[PDB]
Amino acid sequence: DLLVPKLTASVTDGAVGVTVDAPVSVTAADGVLAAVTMVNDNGRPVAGRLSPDGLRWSTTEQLGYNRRYTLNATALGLGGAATRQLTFQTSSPAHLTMPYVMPGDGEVVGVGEPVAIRFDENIADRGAAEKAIKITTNPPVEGAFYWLNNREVRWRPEHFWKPGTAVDVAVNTYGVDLGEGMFGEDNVQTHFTIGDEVIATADDNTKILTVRVNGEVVKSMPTSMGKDSTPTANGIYIVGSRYKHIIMDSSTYGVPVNSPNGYRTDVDWATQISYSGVFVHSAPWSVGAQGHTNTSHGCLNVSPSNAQWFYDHVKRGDIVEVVNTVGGTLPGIDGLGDWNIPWDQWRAGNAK
Amino acid sequence: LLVPKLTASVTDGAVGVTVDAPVSVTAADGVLAAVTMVNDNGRPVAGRLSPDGLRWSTTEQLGYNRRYTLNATALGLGGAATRQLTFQTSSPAHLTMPYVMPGDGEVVGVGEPVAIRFDENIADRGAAEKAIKITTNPPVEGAFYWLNNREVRWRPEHFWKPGTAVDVAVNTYGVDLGEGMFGEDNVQTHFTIGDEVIATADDNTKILTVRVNGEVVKSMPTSMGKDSTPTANGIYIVGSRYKHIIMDSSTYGVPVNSPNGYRTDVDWATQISYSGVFVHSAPWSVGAQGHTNTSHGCLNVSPSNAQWFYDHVKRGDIVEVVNTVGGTLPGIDGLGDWNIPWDQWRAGNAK
Ligand SMILES: *CC(=O)[C@H]1O[C@@H]1c1ccccc1
């Protein structure tokens, strides 16, 4: 009279819709696992590993969608043996969606850079997407998720990041039902660091763009912003990509070139600060207007010299704030206007 | 013509007849004229003959440790038939009474498990599980798991969906629960799942955020257990609510006179673990709430936030703790059912 080994698996025989966001395990009690195999609906075996003590076996590669797996396990012991065969089917997505995360892995970014997770499909279950995203911060700081549209979600703290903060983003979305049968195509995993505090302020009262590094003025640039008919909106702008030169085409923003407010001109040293088309760029033609009157379509015109300096000394995530213009406020969902949404609204989020 | 034939759901001379079902008498090639059943004291058992005269059944429950005598007369085209049966019902060595939670008619949160607590150790856990019928609308899969030798729990893999109906039929009367132990009685309870309410206490931020149906409705600065007596991570099920309570550490195994012991009156206390973790009013730690941990394990919040928790949270709601320096709440705590992985829970420990 002795104990008979028992077998415990993380799946049920006959189970359907098994999610592939976790390994499949099989455990032996009152005995050890003598043989554990697992094959798919073809013949190919599934990779796995057994613990040295012989009690725990797990798969070591990710399991695929739309697969029927067959699991055979045998357990031995002083008091007998036990064998079990289990077959189960994994999730069968209706559609797949792949996430993309910014900033890039290893980047050093300014204090205003939000964590960004953009999917290539609409997300029916935003809560499920948020649950699947794990964000670590050192030093730890509370942030919250907020959706700019149906496909991109952002995560940021109440105030600007503290320089030196380490941020780690893991979007563990493979095998996760993101709503209406849409499952994540894969996981993504990026890490970045917050750099120096760089805040540039363009004051319409003075028509000056002052760059502050760690709270001290390092550059004062005369500027000409949008005229009354096409003014530059007030608010907080997040610096984005930087270009040695770029063709500013209004058609990419929905405004034809031939229309009154349209344009197509090649400019130098252009730093993007809004998705709606606001740049800090070289503007030789308005050097005389810079510091006095507004003549552009919204962009912050500066001298070629100050434009190259801005390009060289400003990095993705730095902040450009505009105040006292005749325009409104930059939309919070512009894509670089995250900080214009009041914190209570951002904190509460819009997972619905 | 044919002499009618009389058959019964019991047979003459039977012993150990279980009283979980009624006794019946059926006629073939004829009809029943009369059926009488009496116990050993000569008291008749209430019974009902079907309109067609073919089937007779007891209409009251039969007792343990009883000898019943059944007499049936039948008439057919070929003549009459008569029969007399005698049988003896189960003679339990012991009886056990079940207790079922939550209460009948209640509205509970999405983490509320079905509970059946017997007042004796159950030697045949499989027999008790087989005798408990759970109905859910909308239907959802669930499984049994035993916290101790006397209490068994039933829950789904994921939290309940709001609006779900749950019907529990503990049909243990007349059932052998092992080693001659039989159910003292049956129990029936029905309850409903209300709004989804999930409160997350994050130790990295030291905020207790209450979400009702996915919407942030309250943010409470909190002070959890200090390093020496930390608040454990994991999922807590909300239990009882107290306008005021005497926190006594001996109730949870720690002598009051010991270093980690305590005995203080506390306002607006919501229990979330049998181990003694509460959400309660802590005016003495208002400065530390949202900054540092200073408690014995409880979630300290301000008086206004404690009372708010008392009013808007109900039995079955969820409090989840994360990023603390403690361990994970035991799955068999009594309110930590969800800390058991579904595979371990579904497999069960019925043996
Ligand atoms: C965003 C802007 O207002 C600048 O790109 C605008 C432009 C530059 C040069 C000529 C015409 C328009």
mmCIF file of all heavy atoms in Angstrom, chain A residues 198-202 208-213 215-222 302-314:
data_model
loop_
_atom_site.group_PDB
_atom_site.id
_atom_site.type_symbol
_atom_site.label_atom_id
_atom_site.label_comp_id
_atom_site.label_asym_id
_atom_site.label_seq_id
_atom_site.Cartn_x
_atom_site.Cartn_y
_atom_site.Cartn_z
ATOM 1 N N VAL A 198 14.866 69.991 -21.162
ATOM 2 C CA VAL A 198 15.002 71.006 -22.200
ATOM 3 C C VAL A 198 13.609 71.524 -22.515
ATOM 4 O O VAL A 198 12.780 70.785 -23.049
ATOM 5 C CB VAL A 198 15.684 70.468 -23.467
ATOM 6 C CG1 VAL A 198 16.014 71.632 -24.432
ATOM 7 C CG2 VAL A 198 16.947 69.708 -23.104
ATOM 8 N N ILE A 199 13.354 72.798 -22.209
ATOM 9 C CA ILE A 199 12.045 73.413 -22.403
ATOM 10 C C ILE A 199 12.242 74.718 -23.158
ATOM 11 O O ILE A 199 12.932 75.621 -22.670
ATOM 12 C CB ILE A 199 11.321 73.665 -21.069
ATOM 13 C CG1 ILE A 199 11.255 72.366 -20.245
ATOM 14 C CG2 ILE A 199 9.927 74.220 -21.320
ATOM 15 C CD1 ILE A 199 10.584 72.527 -18.894
ATOM 16 N N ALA A 200 11.645 74.812 -24.343
ATOM 17 C CA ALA A 200 11.686 76.012 -25.164
ATOM 18 C C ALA A 200 10.330 76.699 -25.111
ATOM 19 O O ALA A 200 9.294 76.045 -25.261
ATOM 20 C CB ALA A 200 12.035 75.678 -26.610
ATOM 21 N N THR A 201 10.335 78.009 -24.897
ATOM 22 C CA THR A 201 9.108 78.781 -24.749
ATOM 23 C C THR A 201 9.067 79.877 -25.810
ATOM 24 O O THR A 201 9.961 80.730 -25.868
ATOM 25 C CB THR A 201 9.007 79.393 -23.346
ATOM 26 O OG1 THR A 201 9.220 78.378 -22.357
ATOM 27 C CG2 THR A 201 7.639 80.025 -23.134
ATOM 28 N N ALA A 202 8.024 79.856 -26.636
ATOM 29 C CA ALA A 202 7.794 80.866 -27.659
ATOM 30 C C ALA A 202 6.668 81.766 -27.168
ATOM 31 O O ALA A 202 5.516 81.336 -27.085
ATOM 32 C CB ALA A 202 7.443 80.223 -28.997
ATOM 33 N N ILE A 208 9.758 85.832 -29.234
ATOM 34 C CA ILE A 208 11.063 85.250 -28.953
ATOM 35 C C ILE A 208 10.877 83.797 -28.524
ATOM 36 O O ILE A 208 9.926 83.468 -27.809
ATOM 37 C CB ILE A 208 11.806 86.037 -27.856
ATOM 38 C CG1 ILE A 208 11.979 87.513 -28.235
ATOM 39 C CG2 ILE A 208 13.157 85.380 -27.575
ATOM 40 C CD1 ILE A 208 12.897 87.742 -29.419
ATOM 41 N N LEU A 209 11.790 82.935 -28.958
ATOM 42 C CA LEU A 209 11.797 81.520 -28.601
ATOM 43 C C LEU A 209 13.025 81.247 -27.744
ATOM 44 O O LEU A 209 14.146 81.195 -28.265
ATOM 45 C CB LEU A 209 11.806 80.648 -29.849
ATOM 46 C CG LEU A 209 12.047 79.151 -29.636
ATOM 47 C CD1 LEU A 209 11.070 78.577 -28.621
ATOM 48 C CD2 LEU A 209 11.950 78.405 -30.953
ATOM 49 N N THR A 210 12.808 81.056 -26.437
ATOM 50 C CA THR A 210 13.889 80.904 -25.470
ATOM 51 C C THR A 210 14.045 79.433 -25.117
ATOM 52 O O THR A 210 13.083 78.790 -24.671
ATOM 53 C CB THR A 210 13.610 81.720 -24.210
ATOM 54 O OG1 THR A 210 13.260 83.055 -24.580
ATOM 55 C CG2 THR A 210 14.822 81.738 -23.292
ATOM 56 N N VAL A 211 15.258 78.908 -25.287
ATOM 57 C CA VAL A 211 15.561 77.520 -24.969
ATOM 58 C C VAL A 211 16.198 77.472 -23.589
ATOM 59 O O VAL A 211 17.188 78.174 -23.329
ATOM 60 C CB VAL A 211 16.490 76.889 -26.021
ATOM 61 C CG1 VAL A 211 16.835 75.452 -25.614
ATOM 62 C CG2 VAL A 211 15.848 76.911 -27.393
ATOM 63 N N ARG A 212 15.640 76.642 -22.703
ATOM 64 C CA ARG A 212 16.143 76.493 -21.339
ATOM 65 C C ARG A 212 16.585 75.051 -21.144
ATOM 66 O O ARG A 212 15.802 74.129 -21.375
ATOM 67 C CB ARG A 212 15.082 76.882 -20.311
ATOM 68 C CG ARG A 212 14.836 78.380 -20.223
ATOM 69 C CD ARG A 212 13.785 78.730 -19.174
ATOM 70 N NE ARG A 212 13.682 80.174 -18.982
ATOM 71 C CZ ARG A 212 12.941 80.991 -19.726
ATOM 72 N NH1 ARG A 212 12.217 80.513 -20.726
ATOM 73 N NH2 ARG A 212 12.930 82.297 -19.467
ATOM 74 N N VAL A 213 17.834 74.866 -20.730
ATOM 75 C CA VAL A 213 18.409 73.563 -20.432
ATOM 76 C C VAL A 213 18.641 73.507 -18.928
ATOM 77 O O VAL A 213 19.404 74.311 -18.381
ATOM 78 C CB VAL A 213 19.721 73.331 -21.195
ATOM 79 C CG1 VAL A 213 20.344 71.997 -20.776
ATOM 80 C CG2 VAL A 213 19.491 73.378 -22.691
ATOM 81 N N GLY A 215 16.812 74.500 -16.700
ATOM 82 C CA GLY A 215 16.296 75.695 -16.068
ATOM 83 C C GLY A 215 17.088 76.959 -16.313
ATOM 84 O O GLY A 215 16.837 77.972 -15.645
ATOM 85 N N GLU A 216 18.040 76.943 -17.233
ATOM 86 C CA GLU A 216 18.834 78.126 -17.519
ATOM 87 C C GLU A 216 18.811 78.403 -19.014
ATOM 88 O O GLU A 216 18.932 77.487 -19.831
ATOM 89 C CB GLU A 216 20.280 77.976 -17.033
ATOM 90 C CG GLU A 216 21.090 76.922 -17.749
ATOM 91 C CD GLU A 216 22.470 76.746 -17.126
ATOM 92 O OE1 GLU A 216 22.538 76.212 -15.998
ATOM 93 O OE2 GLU A 216 23.481 77.157 -17.750
ATOM 94 N N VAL A 217 18.674 79.680 -19.353
ATOM 95 C CA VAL A 217 18.569 80.112 -20.743
ATOM 96 C C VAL A 217 19.905 79.851 -21.423
ATOM 97 O O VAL A 217 20.948 80.322 -20.961
ATOM 98 C CB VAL A 217 18.181 81.594 -20.839
ATOM 99 C CG1 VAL A 217 18.187 82.061 -22.295
ATOM 100 C CG2 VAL A 217 16.803 81.813 -20.203
ATOM 101 N N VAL A 218 19.880 79.116 -22.531
ATOM 102 C CA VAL A 218 21.076 78.888 -23.332
ATOM 103 C C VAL A 218 20.963 79.466 -24.733
ATOM 104 O O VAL A 218 21.994 79.594 -25.415
ATOM 105 C CB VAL A 218 21.417 77.384 -23.416
ATOM 106 C CG1 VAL A 218 21.613 76.796 -22.010
ATOM 107 C CG2 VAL A 218 20.332 76.635 -24.172
ATOM 108 N N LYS A 219 19.764 79.806 -25.200
ATOM 109 C CA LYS A 219 19.591 80.341 -26.543
ATOM 110 C C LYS A 219 18.305 81.148 -26.574
ATOM 111 O O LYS A 219 17.280 80.698 -26.051
ATOM 112 C CB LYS A 219 19.539 79.222 -27.582
ATOM 113 C CG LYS A 219 20.000 79.643 -28.983
ATOM 114 C CD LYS A 219 21.513 79.833 -29.026
ATOM 115 C CE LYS A 219 21.981 80.215 -30.429
ATOM 116 N NZ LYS A 219 21.347 81.475 -30.891
ATOM 117 N N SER A 220 18.366 82.338 -27.173
ATOM 118 C CA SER A 220 17.207 83.214 -27.350
ATOM 119 C C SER A 220 17.057 83.494 -28.839
ATOM 120 O O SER A 220 17.892 84.187 -29.432
ATOM 121 C CB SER A 220 17.371 84.511 -26.563
ATOM 122 O OG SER A 220 17.617 84.233 -25.192
ATOM 123 N N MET A 221 16.003 82.940 -29.441
ATOM 124 C CA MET A 221 15.841 82.983 -30.884
ATOM 125 C C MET A 221 14.692 83.894 -31.283
ATOM 126 O O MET A 221 13.546 83.626 -30.896
ATOM 127 C CB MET A 221 15.588 81.579 -31.406
ATOM 128 C CG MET A 221 16.578 80.528 -30.952
ATOM 129 S SD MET A 221 16.073 78.918 -31.566
ATOM 130 C CE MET A 221 17.569 77.946 -31.262
ATOM 131 N N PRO A 222 14.933 84.959 -32.055
ATOM 132 C CA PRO A 222 13.808 85.688 -32.660
ATOM 133 C C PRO A 222 13.028 84.756 -33.571
ATOM 134 O O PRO A 222 13.614 83.944 -34.295
ATOM 135 C CB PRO A 222 14.481 86.817 -33.451
ATOM 136 C CG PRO A 222 15.865 86.941 -32.867
ATOM 137 C CD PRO A 222 16.240 85.545 -32.415
ATOM 138 N N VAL A 302 12.515 80.550 -37.627
ATOM 139 C CA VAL A 302 13.716 81.084 -37.003
ATOM 140 C C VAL A 302 14.788 81.219 -38.083
ATOM 141 O O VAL A 302 14.627 80.767 -39.221
ATOM 142 C CB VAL A 302 14.200 80.189 -35.840
ATOM 143 C CG1 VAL A 302 13.117 80.084 -34.784
ATOM 144 C CG2 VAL A 302 14.608 78.821 -36.342
ATOM 145 N N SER A 303 15.881 81.879 -37.727
ATOM 146 C CA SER A 303 16.975 82.044 -38.669
ATOM 147 C C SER A 303 17.576 80.681 -39.012
ATOM 148 O O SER A 303 17.459 79.726 -38.239
ATOM 149 C CB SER A 303 18.056 82.945 -38.083
ATOM 150 O OG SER A 303 18.718 82.305 -37.006
ATOM 151 N N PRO A 304 18.207 80.558 -40.181
ATOM 152 C CA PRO A 304 18.942 79.314 -40.475
ATOM 153 C C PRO A 304 19.866 78.915 -39.345
ATOM 154 O O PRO A 304 19.977 77.731 -39.014
ATOM 155 C CB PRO A 304 19.730 79.660 -41.750
ATOM 156 C CG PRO A 304 18.956 80.763 -42.382
ATOM 157 C CD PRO A 304 18.320 81.549 -41.263
ATOM 158 N N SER A 305 20.547 79.899 -38.751
ATOM 159 C CA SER A 305 21.469 79.626 -37.653
ATOM 160 C C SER A 305 20.742 79.016 -36.459
ATOM 161 O O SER A 305 21.134 77.959 -35.949
ATOM 162 C CB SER A 305 22.178 80.922 -37.250
ATOM 163 O OG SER A 305 22.863 80.753 -36.025
ATOM 164 N N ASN A 306 19.687 79.682 -35.990
ATOM 165 C CA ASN A 306 18.948 79.175 -34.842
ATOM 166 C C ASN A 306 18.242 77.863 -35.157
ATOM 167 O O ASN A 306 18.041 77.048 -34.254
ATOM 168 C CB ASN A 306 17.948 80.224 -34.367
ATOM 169 C CG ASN A 306 18.617 81.370 -33.666
ATOM 170 O OD1 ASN A 306 19.622 81.185 -32.981
ATOM 171 N ND2 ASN A 306 18.070 82.570 -33.827
ATOM 172 N N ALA A 307 17.876 77.634 -36.420
ATOM 173 C CA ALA A 307 17.238 76.371 -36.780
ATOM 174 C C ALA A 307 18.216 75.212 -36.663
ATOM 175 O O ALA A 307 17.876 74.154 -36.115
ATOM 176 C CB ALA A 307 16.677 76.453 -38.196
ATOM 177 N N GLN A 308 19.447 75.402 -37.146
ATOM 178 C CA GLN A 308 20.445 74.346 -37.022
ATOM 179 C C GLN A 308 20.818 74.114 -35.564
ATOM 180 O O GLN A 308 21.054 72.975 -35.156
ATOM 181 C CB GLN A 308 21.687 74.688 -37.845
ATOM 182 C CG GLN A 308 22.799 73.658 -37.727
ATOM 183 C CD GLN A 308 23.922 73.881 -38.727
ATOM 184 O OE1 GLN A 308 24.141 74.997 -39.203
ATOM 185 N NE2 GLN A 308 24.631 72.807 -39.061
ATOM 186 N N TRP A 309 20.895 75.184 -34.771
ATOM 187 C CA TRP A 309 21.180 75.031 -33.355
ATOM 188 C C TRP A 309 20.081 74.225 -32.670
ATOM 189 O O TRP A 309 20.362 73.304 -31.901
ATOM 190 C CB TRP A 309 21.321 76.400 -32.698
ATOM 191 C CG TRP A 309 21.820 76.324 -31.275
ATOM 192 C CD1 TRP A 309 23.097 76.540 -30.846
ATOM 193 C CD2 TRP A 309 21.055 75.998 -30.108
ATOM 194 N NE1 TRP A 309 23.172 76.383 -29.490
ATOM 195 C CE2 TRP A 309 21.933 76.045 -29.010
ATOM 196 C CE3 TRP A 309 19.716 75.678 -29.885
ATOM 197 C CZ2 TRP A 309 21.515 75.775 -27.704
ATOM 198 C CZ3 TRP A 309 19.298 75.410 -28.582
ATOM 199 C CH2 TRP A 309 20.199 75.462 -27.509
ATOM 200 N N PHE A 310 18.815 74.572 -32.936
ATOM 201 C CA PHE A 310 17.694 73.815 -32.387
ATOM 202 C C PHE A 310 17.773 72.352 -32.798
ATOM 203 O O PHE A 310 17.565 71.454 -31.975
ATOM 204 C CB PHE A 310 16.383 74.449 -32.853
ATOM 205 C CG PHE A 310 15.213 74.148 -31.972
ATOM 206 C CD1 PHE A 310 14.934 74.950 -30.882
ATOM 207 C CD2 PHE A 310 14.387 73.060 -32.233
ATOM 208 C CE1 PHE A 310 13.850 74.680 -30.059
ATOM 209 C CE2 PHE A 310 13.302 72.781 -31.409
ATOM 210 C CZ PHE A 310 13.026 73.596 -30.332
ATOM 211 N N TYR A 311 18.087 72.097 -34.068
ATOM 212 C CA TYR A 311 18.227 70.729 -34.553
ATOM 213 C C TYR A 311 19.323 69.989 -33.804
ATOM 214 O O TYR A 311 19.188 68.794 -33.513
ATOM 215 C CB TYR A 311 18.510 70.756 -36.060
ATOM 216 C CG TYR A 311 18.852 69.423 -36.688
ATOM 217 C CD1 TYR A 311 17.903 68.708 -37.408
ATOM 218 C CD2 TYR A 311 20.128 68.896 -36.585
ATOM 219 C CE1 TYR A 311 18.210 67.493 -37.982
ATOM 220 C CE2 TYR A 311 20.446 67.678 -37.156
ATOM 221 C CZ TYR A 311 19.485 66.980 -37.850
ATOM 222 O OH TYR A 311 19.810 65.769 -38.419
ATOM 223 N N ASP A 312 20.418 70.680 -33.481
ATOM 224 C CA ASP A 312 21.559 70.009 -32.876
ATOM 225 C C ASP A 312 21.417 69.829 -31.370
ATOM 226 O O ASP A 312 22.036 68.920 -30.803
ATOM 227 C CB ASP A 312 22.847 70.794 -33.154
ATOM 228 C CG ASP A 312 23.254 70.763 -34.615
ATOM 229 O OD1 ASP A 312 22.814 69.831 -35.322
ATOM 230 O OD2 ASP A 312 24.018 71.664 -35.043
ATOM 231 N N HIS A 313 20.636 70.677 -30.707
ATOM 232 C CA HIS A 313 20.581 70.689 -29.250
ATOM 233 C C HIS A 313 19.247 70.232 -28.671
ATOM 234 O O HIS A 313 19.100 70.192 -27.443
ATOM 235 C CB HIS A 313 20.891 72.094 -28.726
ATOM 236 C CG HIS A 313 22.324 72.495 -28.889
ATOM 237 N ND1 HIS A 313 22.823 73.031 -30.056
ATOM 238 C CD2 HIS A 313 23.365 72.432 -28.026
ATOM 239 C CE1 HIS A 313 24.113 73.273 -29.905
ATOM 240 N NE2 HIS A 313 24.464 72.920 -28.682
ATOM 241 N N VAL A 314 18.274 69.892 -29.508
ATOM 242 C CA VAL A 314 16.972 69.425 -29.053
ATOM 243 C C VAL A 314 16.781 67.995 -29.522
ATOM 244 O O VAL A 314 17.131 67.658 -30.658
ATOM 245 C CB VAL A 314 15.836 70.327 -29.571
ATOM 246 C CG1 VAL A 314 14.499 69.830 -29.099
ATOM 247 C CG2 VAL A 314 16.064 71.774 -29.112
#
